[PDB]
Every structure is written in C-alpha cells, then in structure tokens.
Amino acid sequence: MFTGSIVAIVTPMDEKGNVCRASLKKLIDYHVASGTSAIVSVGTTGEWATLNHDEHADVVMMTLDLADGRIPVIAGTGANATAEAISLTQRFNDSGIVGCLTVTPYYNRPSQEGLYQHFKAIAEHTDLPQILYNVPSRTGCDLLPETVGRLAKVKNIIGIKEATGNLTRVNQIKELVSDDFVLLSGDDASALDFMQLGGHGVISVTANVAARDMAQMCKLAAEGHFAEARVINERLMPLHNKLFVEPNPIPVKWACKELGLVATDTLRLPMTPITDSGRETVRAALKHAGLL
Amino acid sequence: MFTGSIVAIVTPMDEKGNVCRASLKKLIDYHVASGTSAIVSVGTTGEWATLNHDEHADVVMMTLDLADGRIPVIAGTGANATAEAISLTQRFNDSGIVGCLTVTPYYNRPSQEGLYQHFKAIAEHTDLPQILYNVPSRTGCDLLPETVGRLAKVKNIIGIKEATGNLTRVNQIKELVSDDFVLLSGDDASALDFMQLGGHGVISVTANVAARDMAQMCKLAAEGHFAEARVINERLMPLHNKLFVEPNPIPVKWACKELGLVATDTLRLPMTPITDSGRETVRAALKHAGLL
Amino acid sequence: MFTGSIVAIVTPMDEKGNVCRASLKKLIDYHVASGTSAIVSVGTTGEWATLNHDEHADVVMMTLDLADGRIPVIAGTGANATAEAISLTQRFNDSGIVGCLTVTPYYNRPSQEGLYQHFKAIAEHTDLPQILYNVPSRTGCDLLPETVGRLAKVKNIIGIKEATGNLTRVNQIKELVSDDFVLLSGDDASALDFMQLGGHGVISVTANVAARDMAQMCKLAAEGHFAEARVINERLMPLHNKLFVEPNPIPVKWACKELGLVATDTLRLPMTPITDSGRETVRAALKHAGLL
Amino acid sequence: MFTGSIVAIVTPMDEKGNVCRASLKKLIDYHVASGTSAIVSVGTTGEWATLNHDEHADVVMMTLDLADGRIPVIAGTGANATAEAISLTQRFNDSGIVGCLTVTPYYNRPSQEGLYQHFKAIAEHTDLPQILYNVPSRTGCDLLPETVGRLAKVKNIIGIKEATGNLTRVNQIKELVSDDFVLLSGDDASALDFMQLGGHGVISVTANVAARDMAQMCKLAAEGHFAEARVINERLMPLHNKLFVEPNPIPVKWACKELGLVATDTLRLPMTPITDSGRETVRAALKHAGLL
Numbered sequence A, B, C, D: 001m002f003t004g005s006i007v008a009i010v011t012p013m014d015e016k017g018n019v020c021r022a023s024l025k026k027l028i029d030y031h032v033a034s035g036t037s038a039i040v041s042v043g044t045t046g047e048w049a050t051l052n053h054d055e056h057a058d059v060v061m062m063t064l065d066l067a068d069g070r071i072p073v074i075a076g077t078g079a080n081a082t083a084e085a086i087s088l089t090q091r092f093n094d095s096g097i098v099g100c101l102t103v104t105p106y107y108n109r110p111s112q113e114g115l116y117q118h119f120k121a122i123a124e125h126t127d128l129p130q131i132l133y134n135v136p137s138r139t140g141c142d143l144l145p146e147t148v149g150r151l152a153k154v155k156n157i158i159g160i161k162e163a164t165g166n167l168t169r170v171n172q173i174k175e176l177v178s179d180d181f182v183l184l185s186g187d188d189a190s191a192l193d194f195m196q197l198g199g200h201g202v203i204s205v206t207a208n209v210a211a212r213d214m215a216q217m218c219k220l221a222a223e224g225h226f227a228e229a230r231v232i233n234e235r236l237m238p239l240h241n242k243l244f245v246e247p248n249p250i251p252v253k254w255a256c257k258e259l260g261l262v263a264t265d266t267l268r269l270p271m272t273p274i275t276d277s278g279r280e281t282v283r284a285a286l287k288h289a290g291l292l
C-alpha cells in the first residue's frame, strides 16, 4: 500500500490527447499481475501538469473502476494555492483512493512556514492519508527536513515522496519523525541507495515498463538483501537514466508504446514527440533491461 | 507602453483575500501621477499563482476600467498547458489590454522545442502583442537566447521579460533579434545594468512603492545618463534587495500598507504575513530610499 | 590500516607557526589509546596548503617517529603538477608510511584523461599504496567514477577518499572496481550514510576531538549495526557541522586547545583566529558530544 | 599599462616541456606590433600552476628582457600561503615589472577576513602595484565586492581581474572604490559587456591569437563605440568560447602553433595534448575569426 514498488502510472492518450481507457486497463492489469504495490494516478508522470481539474478527476475515477479493488490507488492532489488544494482534495474524499500525493507549491516559492501552514490546512480538511512531495527542480521550492518533522506530527500526514536525489535527506528526516512515517524515493536512479539508507519504497517511472523487476528489487531491499537487489538495479540503470533523456513522460510513453502496453505515445503540449535520437537511446535501455 | 518603468502591480486585497477596489484605484492613480509607463496586471507580483482564472480576469478588467485610458495595461496570461494558455489569452482578446506577459511553462520542464511550440501556438491564436517571460528559479525551465531568436520571428512576439539576473543574456538575445524586439528586466537589483547593456526597461517590484524614482531612473537610462541614474539606483538598492527578504509579494504588500497606498497587506496562502524581522528590514530600506 | 576511523590530524603549532612536537606527541598518544585506525599526516586538516615541501616532510617524519610503530601513518602527497607529485612521493618511499593520500590537481582543472595520466604516472614510480582524493569544492575538479574505475586497475591505487558528500558516488564507484578497493568518506556529516551504503571508513576531522566515539561508530557500521552507530553519530552531528563553521582547521584547532590536547590554536595565514561567535558555536557542539 | 587589451601570454615550450626562447620572442614581437597594452607573464594561461618558482621567475625575467621596454609586463605572483606570496613578490621587486597579478588563495578557502589579511600583508611588503585576481571556479574562494572595497584603501592595491563572468560585480565594486581603481575582465566571452558596464579592459586568452582585433575592440569600447566593438566581438565569439573547449591553455597553444606563432604546442601534465575533435573545433573558430 505505501511501501515497495509504487508506479507513477502514465495517463495513456489517443491521437487527440484524450484518455485511452483500453490502454489504461492493459496497464492496470499489468501492474496487478506483476506485483506493483500501488498506483499513483495523475502524478507528475501522469501529466498532472496538463490535465484540467475535471479530466484529472475522471482519470482517477477510471483508474479506481479498472483497478476494481485489486491494487490500491493514490491520487495526485497538489496545488500552489492552499484553497485550491483543499477544494480539490474534497472531490476525492470517499472516492476509494487510499491516499493523496500532494506536491509543495510550485512557482510561488513560499517560506518553510508557508509550507507548514499549507500542508497542515490540507490535512485538517480530509480524513485521507497525505504523502508530501518534494521535487525542487520542478517547483523552485525545497521542503526541508525540519519542516517535514513538524508536519509528521499531523495525524494524517503519513509520509514523503523525496525526489531531490540528495540521499542525505533520508536519515535527516528519519531522525525527526516516528518509525511509522514512510519515506519513498521519487528518483529512480538513486532509489535503491535511498532504500538501503532506510527508505521504504519508490514512486517510480521505471516501474511503468519493468514492473516485475522493480517489485522484486524493492522486496529484496526491504529484506536487507542489497547485493541481490543491486544486480537488478544495474540492469535497470540505463532506464533509470534514459527515461529522462527528454522530459518525462515523453520517453516512458514511447517505451510503453514500443512494448505494446498502450496504443499511442501521444502527450499534451508543451510536451513534444520523442526525437529519433531519443528513440534510439530508450530502445537500447529497454534491451539492456531485457524487455525487448 | 513597452519601455521605461513598468510596474508589476500588487493585487491589493481585503482581510478575506479578495480584491480591494478602492486600494487598486488608489494605486493606479498613483502610477498615473508618478510617470509609470505601463501596468502589468496579475503578473507574479500580482499573485497570478493564487487567483483562479475568473478572479484573474476580474482583476485585469477592473484594472483597465480604473486606468480609464490613462496608462496602458499588460495582462499576465501564462499557463503550463498550451491549450489552457490559448484559452486564457482568447479571453483577453478585445478586452483593451495592449499586450500579454506569458511565462514559460512551469513544473513540467519542456524541451526548447516544446517552448517554441507552446509560444508559437499561443501567438497564433491572438492579435495581441506577446512578451515572453523567463524566470527559471520559479519555473524550473530556462528559455535560452537561441529559442528567443526563433520565436522573435513570429509576428506578434515582440519582447521578453528576462528575470534570470544573468546580464550576459542582454546581448546574446539582441544579436539574434531585430532592433525593435523589446528587452525588459525582471530583476530589480540588476535592471539599471541591464538597461546600460542595451535593454529597454524593467518590469518592476520596486516601482510599486517608488514609482517616481523608478520612472526618473529609466528616463535617465534611456537618455544615456547612467551616472545620474546610478545615484537613484543606489538610493533604491536596499529596496531592490529587501523587497525579497521574504517571498514576493509579502514585503512589497507590507510596504504599500505602511505608505498608505493600500488598506491591508493581506495575501493568499501559502504566502504568509510578514515576520517582525521582515517589517524592520523593509522599514529601514523605505527610510533609505527617503520614502518614509 | 585503510578502513575504520582514520584521523586527518591537525598540525599543532606554537605562537610562531612552527610545528609543536610536544603537542603532536599528545595527539598521537591520544589516537593510539582511543582506537583510531590510522593517521593522515599533512592532509587538508593538517594545513598541507601552507607548509612548504620541507616542513611537510618534517611533520610526516616526526609523526612516524612519535608513532613508533603503534599506529599506521599515511602522508598527504598531492600536487597539481604531475612532475612535482612524482618528485615529492620519492621523498617518502621507505620513510615508514603505509600509503599516500594524493589529491586531484587543484586550480588547473584538468580533463578526466589528464587525471588518469596524472595518477597513473604517480603510481608507476612508487611501490606505496595510493589513495586518490576527490574534493571538488577545494580543487575545482571532480574525479568521476568512470575514471576511478580506470585507475583502480593500476596495482598500487588502492582506494579513494570521496569528499563530495554526494552519496550516489559510493555504489557508482563500487560497481566499477574490485571488492578489495577501499572507499573512504572525506565528509564527516555524511560519513555514516557513506558507510551504510558500502564504504569502508572515514578520513575524519571530528576524530581529532572524538576519537573513541568515531572509532566505535565505525566498528558498529562495519558490523552492520547501523541503528547503534547512528545514536553515536547523532551526538557527534553538531561537531560534524560546526567544525566547518569557519574554514577548517580553524574550529578543530580551537577545540583541541580547549580540551588541552594541544598548547596553542595558532594556524598559518591566510587562516585566521577563530571569531567569538565561532568559539561559542564550537563549544556548544563539544558539550553536545559530551566532551566538555 | 593597466587598461585596454592585456594578453595572458602562453609560456611556449619545447618538446621537453621547458620554455622556448625563440617562440617567446616571436610572441612578444607580435604583441608589440599588434597594439596589445601589456603582457601578463605566468598568469593562469602561462601555466603558473605547473612551473616551479625558479622556472616562473626565469620566464618573467626572459619576458622583460625580450620586451626590451617596448611593452609593460605584469607578473603572476599569487600563492595560497601568505608567507610564500610575500617571498614570491619580494623576488620581483626591482625586476622591471610594472605590477603583480595576485590570485586569491586556492584550495584552502579562507574567510573574507583571511583574504583581507593575505592581500594587505602582500601589499605591505612591496612597492609594486597589485591587481587582485578572483577566479572562484579554479580556487574555491570568491573575493566579494565588500572585501575588494576594503582592500582598495591600501595604497598599492590598484585593481582587480574579475573572472567570475558575473557582470553585476562591475558596478558593485565600482560603487565601493575610487575612480582610479582599475576593473579588468578575466572572462573573454563577457569582456566587452564588462567594459560597457564601466570596466577598463580585459586580461585575455583570445588576445594570444587575435591581438590586433582585441586591441581595436578595446580601443572602440574605451571610446564609447560599442556597436563597432560588438561587430569585432561577434567575429571573435567562437574563439572566446572554443579556446575553452578543453582546459586552458590546451586550445590556445594549439592555435598558436597552427598560426606559426610558436614552434610546439607542448604543455606540462596534467594538461594533455589537444584531442582531434578539439583541433577541429578550434580550427573552425580561427576560420570564423578570419585568422586562417
């Protein structure tokens, strides 16, 4: 549910940019069969950025309908205005999602005290578990360990997706929070290292195309079998890097199409079609992973 | 109209967080009287991030009404989804604004090709002049000079607000565009240097509270009188820096209230009220400028 | 010998900046009694930067004489000209040191191929084990994992002091080198994390004043008892940070004087005496560690 | 003498790595004929890092001999130990150089107070004019404008080589120093912008191979003719960038050999011979400049 390999699932689209239900069903079945712990619906990799609030709700509800109770769903619910994050969250209360993934405000660069008031207010108006989401390269704001410590005292703020790739954050956060607070990597390339230092899992792009291997790697890491998990990570390392050779989710949607998991690799502007050179790098990564 | 001292005007609010019409009128009269060249309505400083699309439109329309033809008005119109930027823009067509300030997509970090396609599409769905806006510390995206060169070929893309504070960009962009493409600073502390290098004006935070000084500074710059302009810049330098002692527009709103230009210094979460230490810093800077 | 807690020992000085033998003897006895694995003589913390080549040799020989076979000594031997590093190394061949700590060329910023030719040539002209030393914040150059992989194939290049604080480097290097190559942290604040990911020890500033606790922490980390080692690291964390509140070794020399391990805290210009505010921060760290 | 186009001259070498007198003479005649204002002997570009103190002195003395009063000579004299900088400087007293270029201590990262004490002490042991040199990418140390202000009060500290490429530093430093303190760029690609902001010249890599163009560029700048200067700058921009395609002075030495100005392009390790791809890049840039 909030540990192990969690996929940040693509939002598959037809040629017009509308959600492809048939493609989504195939992905969801794939994750159920491959042992993925949960699905993050309309996260970053799900083009949270370019869906409107309504389309967003629809993809989440569709994922819940297709999932049919077989795999837990977490929805992306972040916003850069605290009133808007509260309002959006209300739409998912009692939807069937198990939790919300809520990103630090982007663009407006609030203070730490602002982040604290933001997240505390969101949490106050829902019974759903909240997972905080720190990704400074995208938002311009860095939610620091001291603030995560203050927010972890709020009953339903249950963990953090830490996407800095700065592995010192693991034990800085861990020492400030209770043993039940969940630490999840949001950086596939450093995620095994993150788990080895005491993290609990990963919210992953790679998992979209290597679900079984991600699931086994995370299970080995949780049991302490790091040498063994590292053999898997070494085969997935080209994917961990090359799925970001052009802006995510351009590479992963192309990989999903190439494997046949989705009908088209279409995305919404300002995301553009993968370049020829990108296709070649991604294909080589897929073959390194044994997927083609 | 697109040169000299352009104010990025605050959206003054009541204690409930909604626009205060009497305060806005007072500010706009103040800019008319001070010699400000134009007003950017619902830019970053105007809390574009925390107004919904309807509130945003209402503020722009109210600003045009109150300006009553005495001062040109440029609307913030950026979005991180191309479709939504086109909508937002279509909405101000025939409103009376003289142009749009359109920020690079934020959060989703598109490629340069993606930036080119986003702005080209927006420009194609309007007749209004477009000023590109590059502020990578907020967006996670850096619109490079090469791409500005490509976009400057589109008929109604007419300038750029360069808020990197990287002064080498002035002549990198000038080399690639025509003599009538406008270059404006988005960084108060470096704006005089930017104009000395060949830029044409500034979209300014400091102009909210030192409108006459800023207009006089820019007039001297445009005339080649840099040493006279620099005396004015040194008097304003503590404001140029300390209006960012806490996240913009927290300081400038406090300063506006302290000077009697607005009724309340209220902002929307996740922006937080100014700290005491903040108050003290900004008050010292206002004293140095001779404003209080 | 090349694992566990290794101290980067201060070079204690009298009021004129000359090496204080009596102070050095006290330190060396302290490390022998407290279980330190080895001593790095005239490393960074030993003011390698401001001793001339002769003074340098003398401090190393004095440390070896005082040590009297009771604890292994490693000498700092780096230089930014390959001919000079070869020449300096010859002076220590058969001195009694067990190894050399050789920093990447500083200031001149060579390519990776230049680093490879540099270190390979140094290694070629000695039988002494060489430990490579990467500290980009000081040198302007970053010795990358791929190059460390190529250098590890040289018979007597036996390990690396990795002082970036970037914990991803551990397993990037480890996967390219043999199981006998030693990975040592050169960043006290992240050193436990470094060991938890697969590093073998630390070349430490903190060890100068908390030798026994560092030695126990490293032993616990080597046995896999990370929770236990983390209790010690948490008590030493203020030191790990505040020994760098002013440039190293200013704080640690002051701490050593305050504890009575050395007669004076004098250093060589351009290092300056600790500030009052620095003394207060360092003292508080020492008390947190239980040392005062 | 301390304005206009100052060349940071290469130390041409034979195949063994020792100074080539005939090549040096040829370069110095070339600068006399081209209008270069002064020569920096054994600066960074002159391989200050890899010459020992005697070799360094020999090159400066040989340069003064060959210049034969026709062109002023400034010696590199920096060291990271204050005592050693004082020695090095005392050595050039009454040599015939007109001043010294003294870099911030490298590697040991002193405080600003430490920088103040280092340069003040050096200045006190000579009558030669001192030009401070700030190049943080190489040294790990950033000499800030405030500290430049303090040092500019010392009688014989007369200027600064600002190699950050951060153009805001020009007017930050000008505000704090007297009208006769000299500001020189250390960054070819930004040097014209630096002079347009109020700087007085450049210590240039590009001047090694485009001496006449650089002197003409600086003459036009000093006269206020920026648009004419910028035409010359655009012709040289590929050199300004591609003379750093591999670490300086690897490219400029190759270019000097290719133009017939020196006999060999030999450098000292850890600098390595230019790669083939490098050769091709620099040749294209020399073609663009009209030099070959």
Ligand SMILES: N[C@@H](CCCC[NH3+])C(=O)O
Pocket: A048, A049, A050, A051, A079, A080, A081, A084, A107, B048, B049, B050, B051, B080, B081, B084
């Ligand atoms: N700054 C905007 C977020 C854009 C929504 C993503 N397409 C707001 O406050 O709602």
Ligand SMILES: N[C@@H](CCCC[NH3+])C(=O)O
Pocket: C048, C049, C050, C051, C079, C080, C081, C084, C107, D048, D049, D050, D051, D080, D081, D084
């Ligand atoms: N750049 C110098 C190193 C200075 C020695 C430290 N005080 C050299 O090549 O030797």
Ligand SMILES: [K+]
Pocket: A151, A152, A153, A154, A155, A156, A157, A158
């Ligand atoms: K909690």
Ligand SMILES: [K+]
Pocket: B151, B152, B153, B154, B155, B156, B157, B158
């Ligand atoms: K245009």
Ligand SMILES: [K+]
Pocket: C151, C152, C153, C154, C155, C156, C157, C158
């Ligand atoms: K080896």
Ligand SMILES: [K+]
Pocket: D151, D152, D153, D154, D155, D156, D157, D158
């Ligand atoms: K002076």
